[PDB]
Design a protein around this ligand. Structure first.
Ligand SMILES: [Zn+2]
Lengths: 52, 114, 71, 108, 24, 177, 130
RNA sequence: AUGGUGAA
RNA sequence: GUUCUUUGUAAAGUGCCUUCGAAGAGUCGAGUUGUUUGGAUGCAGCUCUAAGUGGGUGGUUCCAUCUAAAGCUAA
RNA sequence: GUUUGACCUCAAAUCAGGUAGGAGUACCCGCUGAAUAUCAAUAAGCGGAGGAAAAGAAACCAACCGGGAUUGCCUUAGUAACGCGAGUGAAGCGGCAAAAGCUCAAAUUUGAAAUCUGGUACCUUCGGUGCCCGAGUUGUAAUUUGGAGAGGG
């Protein structure tokens, strides 16, 4: 039961990974390669009114 | 099927005993044959005995009405450990000094904004 | 050498020693040892009928209430 | 060998206990006002930290009694002496601010 | 306390001297 | 109060008066059973300062223990085993000689309604106090356990076995430090 | 364990108790004003801030008056026994306002009350009656 | 080594 | 919130003045013998056995801190 | 009094009201305990409790411009220290979780043992009242537990 289960990750590296993931969403080609059917989105990144 | 307890509640001790004797005689007569009626009479016997026991227990409770130290049979069956673990009054008992201190400085309700 | 024991009936009641090696009869305490883990399991509570212990949990859930339903 | 798999469970239980205390102790802030303390062990004397409870002298200088102060949420420690005017003044000011900010409902 | 000293003196006179004290 | 006089008199243990009293009392007890019910304590000041009160519910027992598991602990265990329905609160020394040492133990009956309704003594009625001497919770038991504050009891401040378990365990968090 | 298997096999049935959800939900039970304004959707600290109250007096670890007016407004929401009154009247008639003379009355001042207590009681009686 | 079993 | 009761020259608190002002002995302690500690401490058989402006714990003339030998108490 | 009473002590009753064994046992407390240093206050054994147990509000930690119940975690720290050899191995301070203080002995209620257990009849029955019985004076209630506290104005 005392086998390692959780992996310690530097907070700075965690923030770097999150920032890179957020940035990757700005490229339609990269998003298309992810398998999402974003071929018909009017704009990327997709911005909608707060009323949603 | 069989006798109804709600009908037997109001029957007297002698009537209940007579009914029990009749049911026992019927069961003995049926045993010679060896037949769902046997089950019905057996259930009726148990119902009559239970009604008689219930009447006797309430009579015993009535004769011991209100007086201290009733028979242990009628006493609570909760558990051995709950007869100990001093009752609410004993636990709530507090010395006069502590009561005076509480009255003089009771715990107040307050909030900290202004 | 051994005979039926009233307390347990394990047929381990020594005739000459007049004692049961399994349950410890006639000793008040029931013979048991930590090293006998299998022996403890064979005689641990719950192996029998548990005529009374079964209903304790149910009675506690109701707060050991008494009386009858008000209909 | 003990593994703290319950760490998240322990935190959740502590949060639930705090919420229950708040529900029972809604009006009050769940905490007793503590005094400022200067530590021994010069390696740490520069650091000021909260203490157990205010001294009797500080409570008296604050215009209230220890018995009454406790019922209002002020921690009282009769074991600590006073040997610094600055700390005493800071504790008195903190107690005065607490008294000026607390609201007490009537017992009627 | 004067009362405590008086009680101690009274006890001293009542109890006399201990066997080891008597050696003096 | 007179109890101060009693304490002062008892301070001079080797006084010829206390010697006579002790040698008379030991001889008197030598003709009685090892454990027997005592009508009243022979050291009222000690019992009173130990929490004993002259009211229905308290019991005084005198027990004889062979000289040479302390003697007081043995006496407490014996009285608790014999007085299964009573709780041992405290005990004090009352006599000694070349062959035997005598101690007096005061017991409180939790079944008596007087104790149950006594706000200052109903605490002993809790089941957690059963057989205090058995777990060494009495004054003598705690003293023998080394329970105290300071460097002199660091290794036995609270639990000699507990510290060994604590220093033998391997604490591992979800995220290794 | 053996007992668990026996219970599972027994026809008595388990005494099921479902209370996991009730651990998260706690209803305020110490104030009527807070209950009306308290929102269970927010946390303890968030609810205290919304009400305008402090949930911690000491510097909390880790990173972080429209309602108090009602609490402030909430803040704005003994006699003498007949025998005591008769005793006071007797002394007042016998000595009037002469407190010093009243103090030495051996057969009316049964309890040797001080001049201050006597005058305070007499003033209370006069205010209550005349 | 600890605790038990039967065996004159 | 709602309703009946209080009372009795009853019980407490605040500031001042005044007169007083108790403290766990076969116990602490030393000796020795068994025992534990990586601590030299503590535990334990027994000879003796301490004082009340007294006693315990620590250092360069002593200065710093408490009042043991009783007990209860949720987190 | 060639008697009759106060107690104290000791026995008995198919006396009335009560409790004790044992079971379970992962955790708790105590005793004991192997295979001069090491496996070790482990394994096994015995006794005693609960949902937690123990401990707990210092004859404490420190030598500082001092901290102030107990308990658990990180840190202190694999350091001080020891057996200086293989090896064992702390604790204050610091941060965190949770915080609550109290009760007797001790000095006269003596202008009123004011205290309490039990029996009896009721009621609003985890208890209350009128009466009786007994315990208590070799001390049951209130007033004080060093933060002092007590009689008075
Ligand atoms: Zn058997």
């Amino acid at each position: 039961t005392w086998r390692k289960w959780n992996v310690k990750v530097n907070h700075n590296e965690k923030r770097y990974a999150t920032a890179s993931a957020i940035a990757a969403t700005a490229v339609a080609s990269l998003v298309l390669a992810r398998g999402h059917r974003v071929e018909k989105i009017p704009e990327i990144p997709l911005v909608v009114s707060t009323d949603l | 099927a069989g006798v109804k307890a709600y009908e037997l509640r109001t029957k007297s001790k002698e009537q209940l005993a007579s009914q029990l004797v009749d049911l026992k005689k019927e069961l003995a007569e049926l045993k010679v044959q060896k037949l769902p009626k046997i089950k019905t009479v057996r259930k009726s016997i148990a119902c009559v005995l239970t009604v008689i026991n219930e009447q006797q227990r309430e009579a015993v409770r009535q004769l011991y009405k209100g007086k201290k130290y009733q028979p242990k049979d009628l006493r609570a069956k909760k558990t051995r450990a709950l007869r100990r673990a001093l009752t609410k009054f004993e636990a709530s008992q507090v010395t006069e000094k502590q009561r005076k201190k509480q009255i003089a400085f009771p715990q107040r309700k307050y909030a900290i904004k202004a | 050498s051994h005979t039926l024991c009233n307390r347990c009936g394990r047929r381990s009641f020594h005739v000459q020693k007049k004692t049961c090696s399994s349950c410890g009869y006639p000793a008040a305490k029931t013979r048991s040892y930590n090293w006998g883990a299998k022996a403890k399991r064979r005689h641990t509570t719950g192996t029998g009928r548990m005529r009374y212990l079964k209903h304790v949990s149910r009675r506690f859930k109701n707060g050991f209430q008494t009386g009858s339903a008000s209909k | 060998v003990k593994v703290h798999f319950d760490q998240a469970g322990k935190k959740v239980s502590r949060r639930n206990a705090r919420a229950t205390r708040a529900a029972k102790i809604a009006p009050r802030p769940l905490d007793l006002l503590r005094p400022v303390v200067r530590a021994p062990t010069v390696k740490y004397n520069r650091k000021v930290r909260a203490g157990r409870g205010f001294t009797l002298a500080e409570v008296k200088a604050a215009g209230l009694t220890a018995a009454y102060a406790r019922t209002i949420g002020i921690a009282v420690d009769h074991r600590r002496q006073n040997r610094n005017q600055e700390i005493f003044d800071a504790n008195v000011q903190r107690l005065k601010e607490y008294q000026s900010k607390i609201i007490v409902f009537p017992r009627n | 306390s004067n009362r405590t000293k008086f009680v101690r003196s009274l006890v001293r006179e009542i109890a006399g001297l201990s066997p080891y004290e008597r050696r003096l | 109060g007179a109890y101060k006089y009693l304490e002062e008199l008892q301070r001079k243990k080797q006084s010829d008066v206390l010697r006579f009293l002790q040698r008379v009392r030991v001889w008197e007890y030598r003709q009685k059973n090892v454990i027997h019910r005592a009508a009243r304590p022979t050291r009222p000041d000690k019992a009173r300062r130990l929490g004993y009160k002259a009211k229905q519910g308290f019991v005084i027992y005198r027990v004889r223990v062979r000289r040479g598991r302390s003697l007081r602990a043995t006496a407490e265990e014996r009285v608790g085993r014999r007085a299964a329905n009573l709780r041992v609160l405290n005990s004090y020394w009352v006599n000694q000689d070349s062959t035997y040492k005598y101690f007096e133990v005061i017991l409180v009956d939790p079944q008596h309604k007087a104790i149950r309704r006594d706000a200052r003594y109903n605490w002993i009625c809790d089941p957690v106090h059963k057989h205090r001497e058995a777990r060494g919770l009495t004054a003598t038991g705690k003293k023998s356990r080394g329970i105290n504050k300071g460097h002199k009891f660091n290794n036995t401040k609270a639990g000699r076995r507990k510290t060994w378990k604590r220093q033998n365990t391997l604490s591992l968090w979800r995220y290794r430090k | 364990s053996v007992r668990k298997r026996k219970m599972n096999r027994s026809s008595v049935g388990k005494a099921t108790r479902r209370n996991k959800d009730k651990q998260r939900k706690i209803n305020i039970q110490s104030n009527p004003i807070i209950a009306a304004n308290w929102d269970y959707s927010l946390t303890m600290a968030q609810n205290y801030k919304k009400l305008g109250l402090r949930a911690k007096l000491q510097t909390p670890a880790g990173g972080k008056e429209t309602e108090v007016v009602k609490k402030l407004e909430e803040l704005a929401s003994r006699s003498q026994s007949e025998r005591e009154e008769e005793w006071l009247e007797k002394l007042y008639k016998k000595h009037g306002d002469d407190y010093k003379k009243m103090f030495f009355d051996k057969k009316l001042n049964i309890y040797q009350q001080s001049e201050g207590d006597l005058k305070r009681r007499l003033l209370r009686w006069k205010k209550r009656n005349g």
